[PDB]
Amino acid sequence: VDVYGNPIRTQQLREPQTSRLAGLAKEFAQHPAKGLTPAKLARILVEAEQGNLQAQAELFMDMEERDAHLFAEMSKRKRAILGLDWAVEPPRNASAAEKADADYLHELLLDLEGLEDLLLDALDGIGHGYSCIELEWALQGREWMPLAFHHRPQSWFQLNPEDQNELRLRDNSPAGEALQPFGWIIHRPRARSGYVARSGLFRVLAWPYLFRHYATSDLAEMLEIYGLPIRLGKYPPGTADEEKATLLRAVTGLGHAAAGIIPETMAIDFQQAAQGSSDPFLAMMRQSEDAISKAVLGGTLTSTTSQSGGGAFALGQVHNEVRHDLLASDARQLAATLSRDLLWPLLVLNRPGSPDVRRAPRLVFDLREQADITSMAQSIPALVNVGLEIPSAWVYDKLGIPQPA
Amino acid sequence: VDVYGNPIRTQQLREPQTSRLAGLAKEFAQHPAKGLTPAKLARILVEAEQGNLQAQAELFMDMEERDAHLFAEMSKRKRAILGLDWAVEPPRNASAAEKADADYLHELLLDLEGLEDLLLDALDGIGHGYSCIELEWALQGREWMPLAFHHRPQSWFQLNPEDQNELRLRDNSPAGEALQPFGWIIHRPRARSGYVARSGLFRVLAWPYLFRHYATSDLAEMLEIYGLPIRLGKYPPGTADEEKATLLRAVTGLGHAAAGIIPETMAIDFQQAAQGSSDPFLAMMRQSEDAISKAVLGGTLTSTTSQSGGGAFALGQVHNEVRHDLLASDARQLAATLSRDLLWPLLVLNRPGSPDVRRAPRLVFDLREQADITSMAQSIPALVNVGLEIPSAWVYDKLGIPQPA
Secondary structure, X not given: OOOOOOOOOHHHHHOOHHHHOXXXXXXXXXXXXXXXXXXXXXXXXXXXXXXXXXXXXXXXXHHHHHOHHHHHXXXXXXXXXXXXXXXXXXOOOOOHHHHHHHHHHHHHHHOOOOHHHHHHHHHOHHHHOOEEEEEEEEEOOOOEEEEEEEEEOHHHEEEEOOEEEEEXXXXXXXXXXXXXXXXXXXXXXXXXXXXXXXXXXXHHHHXXXXXXXXXXXXXXXXXXXOOOOEEEEEOOOOOOHHHHHHHHHHHHHHOOOOEEEEEOOOEEEEEOOOOOOOHHHHHHHHHHHHHHHHHHHOOOOOOOOOOOOOOOOHHHHHHHHHHHHHHHHHHHHHHHHHHHHHHHHHHHHHOOOOOOHHHOOEEEEOOOOOOOHHHHHHHHHHHHHHOOOOOHHHHHHHHOOOOOO | OOOOOOOOOHHHHHOOHHHXXXXXXXXXXXXXXXXXXXHHHHHHHHHHHOOOHHHHHHHHHHHHHHOHHHHHHHHHHHXXXXXXXXXXXXXOOOOHHHHXXXXXXXXXXXXXXXXXXXXXXXXOHHHHXXXXXXXXXXEOOOOEEEEEEEEEOHHHEEEEOOEEEEXXXXXXXXXXXXXXXXXXXXXXXXXXXXXXXXXXXXXXXXXHHHHHHHHHHHHHHHHHHOOOOEEEEEEOOOOOHHHHHHHHHHXXXXXXXXXXXXXXXXXXXXXXXXXXXXXXXXXXXXXXXXXXXXXXXXXXXXXXXXXXXXXXXXXXXXXHHHHHHHHHHHHHHHHHHXXXXXXXXXXXXXXXXXXXXXXXXXEEEOOOOOOOHHHHHHHHHHHHHHOOOOOHHHHHHHHOOOOOO
């Protein structure tokens, strides 16, 4: 069975759950970001709270695509995880059989192509609040294998009417369809405590995005109007339609044309077009960008930048507060999700027996922080000459150097 | 067969797939960037989402050509990869036969001309979202060889109506044509999770490009109008057409001409031409350029520049955060694509047997970061005098010095 105890039947693993839903694969995103107003955004969020996640997912995708600063921040945050070395470790004080199981799982993950793509797809749940990856199960003789990992759009799911924390497929029915066991890797990182609909970071970031969009569009319009002044022509009674058209064309082309002549009975008045500055717009854009930076990566390095300054402890100063905390949180949550969803089916299908769930191997990301070799290498000799018996295992582990074999 | 399991037939390798499509080679780009408005750009993107990639590809090419800042950023990013040393390594704990296969593949890649051009062509997928390179297969006796690598424009492909993630050639039919196995090296880097149409970076960068283009054009127009003032001449009733023309020419040339005389019954009024500054335009250009820099290369070194400051750890400070992450991501994705597309056909055609796919050799890029030799050389003697047995293999690998032979 799975970790949650639901019965597992190997018959349903031959075909993906969504195969019998050919309607989903033919859908196109509705792009709800175009022509978006604060009222529309509020309605979208409220409806999403009630189980209509399609519009929210499409809006989040548009928001990711249309904002360069937000996209850069999210990409940097995800690439931070994608570059971490990982390993599979056996449970606490594991036995020989458990160690062998962990070693086999580690070897299987090493030789499993598409792991990086799986991690990238799973990390989308950081912003979207939940990411679902469908599994393709195949048999190369007697051992089950994940053939491929398919990322399904968040717009394909909904909320259970009887449960606000349980996701279901959109199968044209009011209650949707329950997710098949062992058929998905659902990643639901928890930045804030609440239901799944409210758990996305883009829900926090939506309003600054709209503020920045409005400011940028208004600035573009004002830059378009800038330049020549608006000038209005006046004509006396008894001016025919042809003369009216001639005066109109003359006024229209007068800005580009340096000189022109009109009868003394006519008049042209040059009125202010748009006089001001870009200061308000740019102030709003900077405020929104700082808010986005703080919300995504913390207000110590991105928005209120940590500035330059090297040194042996500079790495620690830059990392440990804020950056290390965020990195560790994301890595630990991703590792927990993976150990729950991918490691367990492999252990319970590819190996004999029914090992207890509490003793399953856990995937661990390498969060080791580079320690100053020079300072500590200076420090050891004094301590050892004093008489302290420092274990070599601690040194080898903390320095990153492996133990002799 | 290929990695995806599709049957492979050596009969079709004698001729390129596109040879029977002589119509494609005679096409010319439509240049959709000229006369581009936000509505046109939105329509282009939406249509591309639906499988019309021709217009999107041509727009991306124009965008690359017409923006100097964006072009410089993309060229720098790609040249970063092009300068990395690479090697082919055998699988985990490989056997003698596998080691020989890996060595032969490494020798073949070393002596294969046009590798750098292949890497450059593949890296175009970073911005375009997908790059297709056609292969020319030839037999120098008993061993198949890639005669040349041909990069085909992204405008030559489309989306499968029944699948939004599968590309097909444009053969005048609604469904296009499936890509021949072993006939292409398709590189599809994944910056964001989604379909192939939405996966390009230029899709994110399009809007800042349009903002900058509008600002620059408006500034150029305003600089053209700047200088002399617009001056309007007025004439009384009873002024004949010849006198009207004389007054018009006098007004037209009055700005260049320092002095002129008119009857007291006439009048010339000098009105403001264009009074303001370049501040709004330049502010918009700077905002767009900063957005492009952040989106392409990260907001730590390019847009918000890291500034000067040397030191032993300066290399790490500049690289590890942002620059190292991006370099490693791009290099790993390119290596995976190459190992999938080019290494496998060579292994399965140029050598006997049917080696298992999981044990295929993998191309690896040298991502080793220069480590401070002096500090660490100071550090070792203390540790070794303490009693730690540090392996020499770790030292030789990390320093870049090769092991004695």
